[PDB]
Amino acid sequence: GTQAEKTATDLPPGFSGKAGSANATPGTKGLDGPTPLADGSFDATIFGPAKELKSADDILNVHRRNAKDPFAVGAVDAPLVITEFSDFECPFSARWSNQTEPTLMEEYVSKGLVRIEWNDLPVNGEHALAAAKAGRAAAAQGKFDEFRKALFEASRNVSGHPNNTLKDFERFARNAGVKDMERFSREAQDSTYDEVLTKAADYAHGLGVSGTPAFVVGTQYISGAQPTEEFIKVIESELKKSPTFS
Ligand SMILES: [Cl-]
C-alpha cells in the first residue's frame, strides 16, 4: 500500500494557510459597487448598524449589508463583513488603508469572501470632521473608495496628522474622479452632512468605540492597525466559524 497517494492531511491552523477561505461560500451579489438612487447619485447619509445592538449577542448587527451603501466594497452576500471605524487624520487609520486593505482586497474582497464597510469615527477634531464631511461628499457621487485612497496615500509618510483642509480635499476629489466639483465643494463645507456625522459619532460611542481604527471582523473586535497577518488569521478563523451567508 506504499505505492499510493492520499489527500493532504489536515494540519493545525498555524500550518494550514487558507482553510477558512477554502471551505467558505463566496457571495455573488453587489460585487459591482453600490446601488445608486433614482438620479444616479448615492445615499451618502448611510451610517449605523443593520439593527439596534442590545447585548454582545447582537454583534453581527454592526454589519449593514445595505446594497445602497456607498461606504462599502465587496459582495452584499459575502460570508464575512469587516466593519471599520476610522478617522481621516489618524496615521493608524492611514496605515491600515495603505498597507493592509490592499492585501484584503486582493485575497478576499475581489473573491466575494469579504465585504468592508466604513464607519466615521472622527476623534482628531476639526480637520477629521471636515475630512469626514468631504468623504461623504465624495460618496454622494460614487467615489468614496477612490477619495479614501487618494487622501490616505497622501498621508503615507506622515507620522502624525496631515492637517488637511478644503483645498486638499478638493485635490483628492479631483484625483478620485468626482465629476461634479461644484456639488463636492459645496457639500464638503455646508451643513449637508453635519447631522449624520453627529449620529455616526454617537452610534460609535454607544458601542464604546473610542479609538481609531477599530474593527468588527465577523464576530471579533480588533482595536488598532494590527499587523496584516493578524487580520488574515482572524478572517480565516471567522470564515471557519461561519462559512456561508444566507
Ligand atoms: Cl446600536
Ligand 1 center from residue 56 Cα (angstroms): 11
Ligand 1 center from residue 169 Cα (angstroms): 30
Across the beta sheet with 214-217, the strand order is 72-73, 114-120, 80-86, 214-217, 220-223
Which DSSP letter does residue 228 get?
H
DSSP 193-238: THHHHHHHHHHHHHTT--SSSEEEETTEEEES---HHHHHHHHHHH
The CA-based angle 99-100-105, given to 5 degrees, is: 115
Residue listed under C-alpha cell 465629476:
179
Residue listed under C-alpha cell 493545525:
12
Which DSSP letter does residue 177 get?
T
Integer Cα distance of 158 and 161 in angstroms: 7
Q: Which of 181, 158, 156, 157 is nearest to 170 (CA)?
A: 181
Q: Which of 134, 33, 147 is nearest to 97 (CA)?
A: 147
**How many domains does the chain contain in total?**
1
Ligand 1 center from residue 44 Cα (angstroms): 19
Task: Give the gyration radius of the chain's Cα atoms.
Answer: 19
Ligand 1 center from residue 244 Cα (angstroms): 24
Ligand 1 center from residue 206 Cα (angstroms): 7
Ligand 1 center from residue 78 Cα (angstroms): 22
Ligand 1 center from residue 120 Cα (angstroms): 14
Resolution stated for this PDB structure, in Å: 1.1
Ligand 1 center from residue 53 Cα (angstroms): 4
Element (H, E) at 132: helix 126-140
Integer Cα distance of 243 and 80 in angstroms: 8
Method: X-ray
Question: What is the domain range of residue 102?
Answer: 1-246
